[PDB]
Design a protein around this ligand. Structure first.
Ligand SMILES: *[C@@H]1O[C@H](CO[C@@H]2O[C@@H](C)[C@@H](O)[C@@H](O)[C@@H]2O)[C@@H](O[C@@H]2O[C@H](CO)[C@@H](O[C@@H]3O[C@H](CO[C@H]4O[C@H](CO)[C@@H](O)[C@H](O)[C@@H]4O)[C@@H](O)[C@H](O[C@H]4O[C@H](CO)[C@@H](O)[C@H](O)[C@@H]4O)[C@@H]3O)[C@H](O)[C@H]2NC(C)=O)[C@H](O)[C@H]1NC(C)=O
Ligand SMILES: *[C@@H]1O[C@H](CO)[C@@H](O[C@@H]2O[C@H](CO)[C@@H](O[C@@H]3O[C@H](CO)[C@@H](O)[C@H](O[C@H]4O[C@H](CO)[C@@H](O)[C@H](O)[C@@H]4O)[C@@H]3O)[C@H](O)[C@H]2NC(C)=O)[C@H](O)[C@H]1NC(C)=O
Ligand SMILES: *[C@@H]1O[C@H](CO)[C@@H](O[C@@H]2O[C@H](CO)[C@@H](O[C@@H]3O[C@H](CO)[C@@H](O)[C@H](O)[C@@H]3O)[C@H](O)[C@H]2NC(C)=O)[C@H](O)[C@H]1NC(C)=O
Ligand SMILES: *[C@@H]1O[C@H](CO)[C@@H](O[C@@H]2O[C@H](CO)[C@@H](O)[C@H](O)[C@H]2NC(C)=O)[C@H](O)[C@H]1NC(C)=O
Ligand code: NAG
Length: 487
């Protein structure tokens, strides 16, 4: 059995390895029982060394480096000794910093060349040479893969050519812009790994464990107009995520759910929290405990598209993305953060309205949540949501008391109330009647019955671009959609 001495496929020139307090995992393949010495250099000087042996059967080897301050460059060498043989592997331009994995479906996959202001965005790289980029090839596998089968974009300094290399190819716009925003704040190296595929349901990205935890039914024939990518359970976890699970990382950002609009829709409130938890457990263990057990996990609540009037699948998914709380983090989704995108619509996208071109605001909103949840900063990252409600049935009023200050444009249809009479309920629009800094009063007088619930922005396309009715007055964040039941 002759096994080449090689690094795992996440290791390359120009890469970013996770910084202190974590140790960075370095692993590869080689000859059974050979000794592998991994050395970190700064030019010719030795910074640290780790020694291990190649395991029989798997022919794999692994070390965990001591924690490193962010920065660089460094070189990593691995040297295998077996009898009198001596082979060496070397990578250079290695940095230490925060490694973020970006995944999901086509609004993660959409690249910098596809977005608004693309020419200027593609040109803005000289200040960001320490924001290193990587993109995983579109591969599916019936079993978990130990190593990536193929890499589309190996670790690289960002350029016009590799940020905008092809339509839905690389580099992910949301991922790049998120990292660019992180660099502005952090001023130390950022590594970005994009691993996404259009038209894919969450089940494709989930291991068997999270699917079983949620009671997901066995697959039938799942391709439909809204599921155009790989849809067999776990096949993208298996090939495009699992091979990264031993690599130490900082967190994940995620943009997916469009393809669950008609595929296990009513389970998404389980399957998405369960994906987060299973990725966390699996990466924590694969990385020898170095990746945080509750590593921060950020996501984009679905944007809009120009749909049929009857369709309220997207509002349901948006709600389920928060585990039906309306906000994250929450009791079922610790250390998570969300960007609202329903107001970031695009009627004229050449990629279809499902692919809106403003990824800049998506990445800005994500980065606020990362600053708060992933970095501990006291920064506003959630939009205004009611904390309490007061029904004044005799006056025909419903007061909503918000979490934060509100800036409200008059809009008499954005809120609806569920009006129950004669053993049936109907949703009716609820006009805005009165305002104070944190309380909005709705009129319920058109309901000649009992009020069971209220909802806000519960439509596939609730508003025109950056024209939703309620924002915070200064954070720029929109009020998220919600439903609330009366007691
Ligand atoms: C296992 O291999 C280790 C890695 O070496 C590679 O793999 C092996 C199998 C060989 O094929 C080898 O050619 C590969 O480089 C090996 O460690 C390496 O060993 C070499 C050989 O001793 C070291 O290179 C020599 O370094 C000295 C010192 O260099 C310093 O000082 C000089 C002089 O002031 C400066 O000019 C340099 O910039 C450095 O600061 C050099 O003097 C010497 O040069 C002479 O020989 C070479 C050919 O070898 C000629 O081309 C030159 O013109 C000179 O005539 C070498 O360059 C190397 O530093 C070392 N690397 C490390 C990381 O330690 C190791 O010994 C092997 N281990 C085992 C267990 O067998
Ligand atoms: C189209 O794309 C271009 C290229 O991305 C974009 O221009 C850039 O806009 C940003 C603002 O988003 C400019 O950022 C400033 O740049 C200066 C000088 O380099 C910095 O000193 C500024 O720092 C402040 O702001 C940061 C947060 O943004 C903070 O982290 C920092 O502490 C400071 O407070 C700031 O980064 C940038 O200079 C230009 N770049 C170029 C090359 O023009 C343009 O806005 C885009 N337009 C649209 C309509 O999307
Ligand atoms: C990347 O991480 C995975 C874990 O997610 C590593 O697989 C795990 O490898 C460990 C250590 O070799 C295995 O543990 C051993 O199990 C045997 C039982 O056969 C036990 O007797 C040993 O004492 C030890 O505990 C573990 O089973 C295995 N886990 C899974 C889920 O496969 C993997 O090796 C890592 N990759 C590399 C290249 O190291
Ligand atoms: C996920 O969302 C679904 C759909 O809203 C929830 O299922 C509803 O839950 C109530 C309470 O058990 C039932 O009375 C409804 O009939 C259910 N509707 C459907 C269509 O099944 C479900 O409880 C949510 N699960 C989680 C974990 O939040
Ligand atoms: C999906 O799973 C089915 C059933 O096991 C299998 O026959 C099929 O080849 C798989 N599809 C792809 C695209 O691999």
């Amino acid at each position: 059995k002759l096994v080449g001495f090689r690094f795992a496929s996440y290791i390359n020139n120009y890469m970013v390895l996770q910084k202190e307090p974590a140790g960075a995992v370095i692993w590869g393949y080689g000859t059974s029982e050979a000794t592998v010495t991994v050395t970190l250099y700064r030019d010719q000087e030795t910074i640290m060394e780790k020694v291990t042996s190649v395991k029989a059967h798997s022919n794999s080897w692994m070390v965990v480096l001591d924690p490193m301050k962010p920065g660089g460059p460094y070189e990593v060498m691995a040297q295998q000794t077996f009898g009198k043989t001596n082979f060496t592997l070397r990578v250079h331009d290695v940095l230490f910093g925060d490694v973020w994995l970006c995944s999901g479906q086509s609004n993660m996959q959409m690249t910098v060349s596809q977005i608004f202001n693309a020419t200027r965005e593609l040109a803005n790289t000289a200040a960001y040479q320490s924001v290193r980029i990587f993109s995983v090839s579109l591969i599916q596998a019936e079993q978990e893969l130990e190593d990536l089968a193929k890499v589309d974009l190996q670790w690289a300094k960002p350029t016009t050519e590799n940020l905008g290399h092809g339509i839905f190819q690389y580099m992910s716009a949301v991922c790049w812009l998120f990292g660019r925003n992180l660099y502005d704040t952090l001023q130390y190296p950022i590594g970005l790994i994009s691993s996404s595929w259009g038209g894919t349901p969450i089940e494709a990205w989930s291991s068997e464990r999270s699917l079983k935890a949620c009671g997901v039914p066995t697959q039938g024939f799942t391709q439909s107009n809204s599921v155009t990518g790989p849809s067999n359970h776990s096949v993208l976890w298996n090939a495009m995520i699992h091979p990264l699970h031993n690599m130490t990382l900082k967190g994940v950002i995620w943009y997916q759910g469009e393809s669950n609009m008609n595929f296990n829709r009513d389970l998404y409130n389980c399957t998405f929290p369960a994906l987060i938890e299973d990725w966390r457990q699996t990466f924590h263990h694969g990385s020898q405990g170095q990746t945080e057990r509750f590593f921060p996990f950020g996501f984009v609540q679905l944007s809009s598209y120009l749909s049929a009037p009857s369709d309220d699948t997207f509002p349901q998914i948006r709600w389920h993305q928060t585990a039906d709380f309306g906000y994250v983090p929450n009791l079922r989704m610790p250390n998570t953060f969300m960007a609202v995108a329903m107001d970031l619509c695009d009627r004229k996208s050449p990629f279809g309205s499902i692919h809106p071109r403003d990824k800049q605001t998506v990445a800005y909103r994500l980065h606020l949540g990362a600053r708060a949840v992933a970095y501990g900063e006291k920064v506003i990252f959630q939009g205004p949501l009611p904390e309490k409600m007061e029904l004044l049935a005799d006056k025909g009023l419903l007061n909503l008391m918000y979490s934060q200050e509100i800036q409200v444009q008059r809009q008499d249809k954005i809120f609806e109330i569920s009006c129950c009479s004669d053993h049936q309920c109907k949703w009716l629009p609820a006009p805005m009647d009165a305002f104070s800094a944190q309380t909005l009063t709705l009129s319920t007088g058109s309901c000649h019955g009992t009020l069971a619930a209220v909802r806000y922005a519960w439509a596939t396309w609730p508003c025109e671009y950056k024209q939703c009715p309620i924002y915070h007055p200064s954070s720029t964040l929109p009020a998220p959609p919600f439903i609330a039941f009366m007691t």
